[PDB]
């Protein structure tokens, strides 16, 4: 783990076959058409801050012993593109936050007529104090969350 905590690899299933590497030091990782986005994807439909993956400290209870997930950090995928995105089987409109599990393929654009399909595979190599890495633990909860003024601020800087 030289620095790349998470690796987003736009796989062949995606119009673009490149590899993106999020660094533990980079939070949140911005994605879109304009390289400004830490992540780089050239999709005419994509936007400047098409979407970004943000990292937050996992909210847990009180550990009265020696156990993990005692306040570590989780990685949330935050879609900011008007073209909406799809992760596994969840919808994510511009202004949503989603939990990212190791080996998560996120599709940011799918066109039936234009045959435009995108999708990157999240591969976590380094765990920068992650409660797990992003795949959670026990009863997986894959639900789309709503973005707030806080997340909106992150994109303000990009």
UniProtKB/Swiss-Prot annotation:
Interacts (via domain FHA 1) with PTC2 (when phosphorylated); the interaction is direct and serves to regulate DNA damage checkpoint signaling. Interacts with PIN4. Present with 6900 molecules/cell in log phase SD medium. Belongs to the protein kinase superfamily. CAMK Ser/Thr protein kinase family. CHEK2 subfamily. It comes from Saccharomyces cerevisiae (strain ATCC 204508 / S288c) (Baker's yeast). Controls S-phase checkpoint as well as G1 and G2 DNA damage checkpoints. Phosphorylates proteins on serine, threonine, and tyrosine. Prevents entry into anaphase and mitotic exit after DNA damage via regulation of the Polo kinase CDC5. Seems to be involved in the phosphorylation of RPH1. Residues 29-92 form the FHA domain. It comes from the Eukaryota. Autophosphorylated. Phosphorylated in response to DNA double-strand breaks; dephosphorylation is mediated by PTC2 and PTC3. The chain holds residues 573 to 730 of 821 of the full protein. It is found in: Nucleus. This is Serine/threonine-protein kinase RAD53. FHA domains are phosphothreonine recognition modules, FHA 1 strongly selects for Asp at position +3 relative to phosphothreonine, whereas FHA 2 selects for Ile in this position. Disulfide bonds: none annotated.
């Amino acid at each position: 783990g030289n620095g790349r905590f998470l690796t987003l690899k736009p796989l062949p299933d995606s119009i673009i076959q490149e590899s993106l590497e999020i660094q533990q030091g980079v939070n949140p990782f911005f994605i879109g058409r304009s390289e400004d986005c830490n992540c780089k994807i050239e999709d005419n439909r994509l936007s400047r801050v098409h979407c970004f993956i943000f990292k937050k400290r996992h909210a847990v209870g009180k550990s009265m012993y020696e156990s993990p997930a005692q306040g570590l950090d989780d990685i949330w995928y935050c879609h900011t593109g008007t073209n909406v995105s799809y992760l596994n089987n969840n919808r994510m409109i511009q202004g949503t936050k989603f939990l990212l599990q190791d080996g998560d393929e996120i599709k940011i654009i799918w066109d039936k007529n234009n045959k435009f399909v995108i999708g990157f595979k999240v591969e976590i190599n380094d765990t920068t104090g992650l409660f797990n890495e992003g795949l959670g633990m026990l009863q997986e909860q894959r639900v789309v969350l709503k973005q707030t003024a806080e997340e909106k601020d992150l994109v303000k800087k990009l």
